[PDB]
Amino acid sequence: LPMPKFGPLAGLRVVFSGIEIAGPFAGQMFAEWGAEVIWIENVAWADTIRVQPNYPQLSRRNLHALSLNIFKDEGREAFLKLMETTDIFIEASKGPAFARRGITDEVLWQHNPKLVIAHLSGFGQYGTEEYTNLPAYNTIAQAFSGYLIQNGDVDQPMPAFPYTAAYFSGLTATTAALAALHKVRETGKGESIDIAMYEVMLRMGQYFMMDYFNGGEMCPRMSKGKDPYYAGCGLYKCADGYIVMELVGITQIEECFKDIGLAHLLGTPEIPEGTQLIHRIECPYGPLVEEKLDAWLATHTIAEVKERFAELNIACAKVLTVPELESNPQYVARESITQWQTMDGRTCKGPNIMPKFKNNPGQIWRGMPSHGMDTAAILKNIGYSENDIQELVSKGLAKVED
Amino acid sequence: LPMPKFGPLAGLRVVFSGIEIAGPFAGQMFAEWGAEVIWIENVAWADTIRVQPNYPQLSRRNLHALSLNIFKDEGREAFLKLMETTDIFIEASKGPAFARRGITDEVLWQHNPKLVIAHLSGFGQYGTEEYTNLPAYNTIAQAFSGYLIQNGDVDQPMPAFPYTAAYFSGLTATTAALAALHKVRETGKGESIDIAMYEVMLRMGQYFMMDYFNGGEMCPRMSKGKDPYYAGCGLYKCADGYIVMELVGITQIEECFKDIGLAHLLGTPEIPEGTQLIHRIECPYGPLVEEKLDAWLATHTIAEVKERFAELNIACAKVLTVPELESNPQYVARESITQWQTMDGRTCKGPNIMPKFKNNPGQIWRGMPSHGMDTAAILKNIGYSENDIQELVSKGLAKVED
C-alpha cells in the first residue's frame, strides 16, 4: 500500500473495526506514528463519525479505507486472509460480538498465530448477561465507573467533556496493543486484550475513590472549579479574568501565605515546618486561606500574578479560550496547530502530530479517505482478482471507491 | 532485582523521575504489566504523592524505590551507569531541565545508544522563554489547551476531574515510549520523545474545536450535563434518578420518537430517512424533542427505561455513585475491584490490573515501596560496593532503607 516511510511504527500493519471515537482513535494513533492502518467500515452504512462536519479530517487522517462485510460468506474469507498479514487488529463491539458471530480469537490465530487482538467494549468480553452485551458510549462508561459522579459542581454532576472516556479507552487500547506487540517480538506468540471502557475509567478516577475503598469517605465535587480538598488549587478570578494555580510545595506555601497576609499561620501545630499542601476541610484555617487568596488575587492583574508566581515557582496559567490558541507564542513556536490538504483538495487546519519524536517524527501524509476509497486496492494486494473483487461488490459484500 | 515473571512486559527495564501523577503514572503502567520499574525520588525530599493517605498504594504498587541525587557528583555517575542497563527512561521536568543541568539526550545515549527517552513537560522541550520552563500541573495543562473552557456548565467553566490531564499525559508517554521501543527493536537506535501536556490535551479536545479552526464557531458548554449539540445525549432524570443515554442511529431515533410522541416528525425535510443524529441547535424541533424526551423519561423508572432501551438498542446506564460499584454484578464477575497486601502488611482494596491480557495477565506482586527502600539493592546490582554505596549515603547523595 503506497505510503511514505516515517515514524517509529513504519511498516507495522494495523486494521481496526469500530465507529465514533474509542476504537478508531486507538487505531488511528498508529497512523499518526507511521503504521499502515486499515479502517474497516460496513458495506451498507458508513462510520457515524462522517456525520461530523470537520473533526473526521483530523481523526481519520493517514488512514486507508476498507468497506467490507466481514461476517458474510466470502466477505469473511477476505477479512481472514487480510488477518494473515496483519500485526494488530483493534475491534470495538458490544461485548464478545465477534466471537458470537463465529470469529473467535482461536479462529483469528488460526490465520495468524502472532496476531495481537484488542477487544474494546463498554463492559468487557465476559461478565454477566445483564451487562456484557450492552452498547456503550463515553457517557455510559463515565456513568458506570463513578467518573461522571465526580465531575461537575457541588450541586450538579455532569460528564467530563468532550467524550473524555472514549479517548482514555482508545488510548489504553493503543498502549496495551503495543505492549502485547513487544511480547510477540519476544516470544513469537499472539495475544488477546480485553479492554472494558468502565475499567479504564474506574482507574482514571481513583485519586480520591481510593479513600472510599479503604476506610474513608468520598470527596465532594468541586465548587466553582476549585479543588475539593486542597486550598489554592483550581480556578481563581484575578481582576481581569480566570486563572488556575496549584499551591503545592513548602516554599510556595510559605511565600504565598506571606503575600496574602497569613504569615503568622506558618509554624503552628496545624501548619508546621515542611507543609507541602493545605487541606481545606481538615484545616480550621482552610476557609480563611481561600478568603485571603481570593482577595489578594482580585487586587492583581493576570499578568502581575503570573510574574509573582514565576518568582515563587507557583504553577499557574491564564484560562485560554479557543480563539486565543492559534496565536499563542508557544503554539506558534512548536507548530502545535498546523495545516494539511484533504482528499477533496481543500486546506484543513488543526493539531499537528503529537507527541514529537526526535529521530522519527510522525507526519501528515494523507487526508481522511472516502467510504470504500481503498477497498479495490486492498483486496488486490491481499490476492483477489479484478473480476473476483467485482463479484464481492456485486453480492453486496463490498463497497468500491465511489 | 527479585520479582515474578509475568505480563507482556516481563524483563523490560524502566526508570522514571517525576512526582504526582503524570510522570509516575506513565512509568507505573509498565509495572502493572510486568516490567522492572525503578521509581527515583530525590535524596532529601520524597515524592509529593506520599502525602495522599490511600491512593499511592494503588499508583505506586509493583515499583522499586531508588532515592538518589541524580545531578550531584557520584550520584550522577551512578544514575548514568544505571542508564546503561535501562531500556526506557521517563522524566518529568519543567521543560528541558535535564539538559540545562548537563544530562542531555546525547549524554544519555553515550551511556546507552538504544535508550528510549521520554520527556514529559507542561509546555515542551523547546518553544519560547515565556513558557518553556514554566512548572505545570493538570489544571495548568487544561487551562492552556482549551480543555478547561469546554468543561462545566453553560455559565461556569471548570476542570475535568480528578486530574484528567495528568492521566492523558502519562498515558501518552507510555504509549509513545512503547512505540519508540518497537523502533529500537527494529533499527537498533534509540529515541527521544517530547510530550507537552497541553499538546496532549489540545488533541483530546478537538471534537468541536475542529469546527472553530475550519470556518465554524466553538460549541457552548453543556447545560445540566446534556450534550451541547445532540439531542438525547448526556444526563437525564427518570422518576427515580439520573441516567445517561445516547440517542444515535436510525432505528433508535425512529422508535424513540414514536415512544415520546414525535412520530409525525419522521420523514420531514428536517428529519429524512436515514437520520442518525439530531442536532438540537440547527433543528427547529430540537427543543421539542428534549421536552418530550424529558417528559417521557420522568414517567418511567430507571429499570423500565433500561428495559425499553435494551429493546431499541439505545445505549444508556444508571449514573452510579461510588458506594454502588463494589457490589455491582459486572464488577464482581470480572474482579474489577480487588485486594492486595501493602508493605506494612495491611489489606488494601482498589482496582485490579487493567486491561485484561489473555495469555499474560498482569498481577499485583508488590505494594508501594517506602522512600529509599531498594536503593542499596539497586546500587549493588549496578556494581557499587557495600562501602562504596555507604559513602554515597554519607555525602548526602543517596537515602538507604529507613
Ligand SMILES: CC(C)(COP(=O)(O)OP(=O)(O)OC[C@H]1O[C@@H](n2cnc3c(N)ncnc32)[C@H](O)[C@@H]1OP(=O)(O)O)[C@@H](O)C(=O)NCCC(=O)NCCS
Ligand atoms: C458503538 C456501538 C454501540 C455500536 O454498535 P451497534 O449500534 O449496536 O452496531 P454497529 O453500528 O456497530 O453494527 C451493528 C452490527 O453490525 C455488525 N457490523 C459492524 N461492522 C461490520 C462489518 N464491517 N461487517 C459486517 N458487519 C458489521 C456489528 O458486528 C454489529 O453486530 P451485532 O448486531 O451482531 O451485535 C458498539 O460498537 C459498542 O458498544 N462498541 C464498544 C464501545 C465503543 O466503542 N463505543 C463507541 C465509541 S465512543
Ligand SMILES: CC(C)(COP(=O)(O)OP(=O)(O)OC[C@H]1O[C@@H](n2cnc3c(N)ncnc32)[C@H](O)[C@@H]1OP(=O)(O)O)[C@@H](O)C(=O)NCCC(=O)NCCS
Ligand atoms: C511538577 C513540577 C512543577 C515540579 O517541579 P519543581 O517543584 O519545580 O521541582 P522538583 O520538586 O521536581 O525539584 C526541584 C529541582 O530538583 C531537581 N530534582 C528532582 N529530582 C532529582 C533527583 N532525583 N536528583 C537530584 N535533583 C532532583 C529537579 O531537577 C528540579 O530542578 P531545577 O530546579 O533545576 O528545575 C515539574 O516537575 C513539572 O512542571 N513537571 C512536568 C509536568 C508534570 O509532570 N506535572 C506534575 C504531575 S500532574
